Design a protein around this ligand. Sequence first.
Ligand SMILES: OCC1(c2ccccn2)CCCC1
Ligand SMILES: OCC1(c2ccccn2)CCCC1
Lengths: 304, 304
Amino acid sequence: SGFRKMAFPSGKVEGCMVQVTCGTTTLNGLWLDDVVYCPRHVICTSEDMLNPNYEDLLIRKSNHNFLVQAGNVQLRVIGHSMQNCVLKLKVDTANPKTPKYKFVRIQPGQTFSVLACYNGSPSGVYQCAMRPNFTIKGSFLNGSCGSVGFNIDYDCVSFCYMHHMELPTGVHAGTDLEGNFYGPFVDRQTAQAAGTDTTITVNVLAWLYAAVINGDRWFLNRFTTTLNDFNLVAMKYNYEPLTQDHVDILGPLSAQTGIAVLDMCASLKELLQNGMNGRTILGSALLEDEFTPFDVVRQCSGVT
Amino acid sequence: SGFRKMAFPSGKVEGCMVQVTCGTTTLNGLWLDDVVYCPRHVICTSEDMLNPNYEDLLIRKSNHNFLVQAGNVQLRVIGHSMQNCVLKLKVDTANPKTPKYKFVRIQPGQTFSVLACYNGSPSGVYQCAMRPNFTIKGSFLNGSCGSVGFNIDYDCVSFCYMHHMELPTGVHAGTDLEGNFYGPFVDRQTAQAAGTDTTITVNVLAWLYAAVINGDRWFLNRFTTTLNDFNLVAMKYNYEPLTQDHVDILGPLSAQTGIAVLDMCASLKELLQNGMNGRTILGSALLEDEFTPFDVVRQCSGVT
Ligand SMILES: OCC1(c2ccccn2)CCCC1
Ligand SMILES: OCC1(c2ccccn2)CCCC1
């Protein structure tokens, strides 16, 4: 029993992290097969970042200007290309520790583990969600760019995120591993305001089911609701709308606990309207939205 | 910027996890050099667990009764001994992935990462604290016993915990890697009530400093206090007493932020007396006590 904000074991990803230096800029790269993936802003001075023309900056760069270090061994760069906002450095050595992997573009509300790295070296691992405004709330200091977000399905790492940017409001923006930003963000030091950080309703409901499964039941009430009624209350509280797709996804948890999804919606409705009155659910004083329904089933069943 | 509940990268520990089977019981073992460490209750039926005589149960066991599997390869057991509440299975092969390591017995309030494992296979990693009542609040299903808690200092894994027990109240109890329980707990299925789960005051203060460093400053007030005055309020709120040792440990964070420790105590005092009034600190609606001062400095500086 017990329910924790749990990251994927990071070993398979630790084995892929390298240091990339271009001039005076050092950040992290991801070494998969004979390609190293890193943010294209590795080629920028902090001055460049105000208004960079990446194509023009890149013309001035040769293979030998990209210093790639894996542990304390240098990799030989034999090619480089820009794909969207990432550089692909071709090296002459396939990473011997390359796991089975995929590049996936996640949807808002989807969760993933981040391996925070500095100078190609892992500092820690934590669990994130892609926010509905396509920001993440991470822990990223200077040097952390090129740190990656991932899911693991048994032995296959799905890479979904590479860290590029802290917005002036201290939230985080990055790309998939094709170098396309999540949301409307750009790799430029400019006014970039995030939109409304709404609560991921389906995730909150999953976590309420996790709470019931783990003995925290005080918030269960005698009420039910409808999707339309619930959604009026959700809108008012800056909660994402709940769809029949979300109800379907919660079916297995509904089944396991014998609490109909719409009954759990009615519990959530009362919690929104009445608050926690100083009580906690799974050691939280607020409604937790960084567990997917899949996360709750995985952790409640013990998948490896 | 940003501050996350962050675990150590788990790769070095993933490389040490094996499956141990004795009869119908499968749990996890830790393979370091040519020794596999596992909970001695691997030799118990669920019936045995009501009132086990471990010495008598062990007499009936031979090396060949301990099935040790590392990935899909069997290890040959060439010796076995009981040390306190752990078994040490001597195997004929040193673990090739053995990291530099130490066995440490942590104090209450100290934090560590758990690698949750089932059948010798990692499912996830999360950050814990040893509670002042010598319980931990983990995520441990059946099969998770032998999962370990650790700290990493650069390249040296300090193992501090091995999972043994869920108490009837759903909190967790285990041993150091010499097999000595934290607190008064025993590996017997019996009435074992935890004492008062007090808040780790020095950790809350560290996290308030982390909040200031990360721009969350709304709780800073115009007041100061004394250790004795603060401690009267702490006692009332089931907070651990604050000692001059704790004040000293917070010195570097005091220095960095220019907030005297006793001023931060006076902020914490008001938060205890007034509550959060529906506000959050680093995305928490309650005062977080699972970051040590060392944790806050590590994460705020980017140690790898
Ligand atoms: O399940 C919720 C938690 C718990 C509570 C009691 C026992 C064990 N675990 C609290 C915070 C995260 C883990
Ligand atoms: O620092 C606190 C958190 C944050 C908030 C804003 C931006 C980035 N990170 C919220 C929860 C954990 C991370």
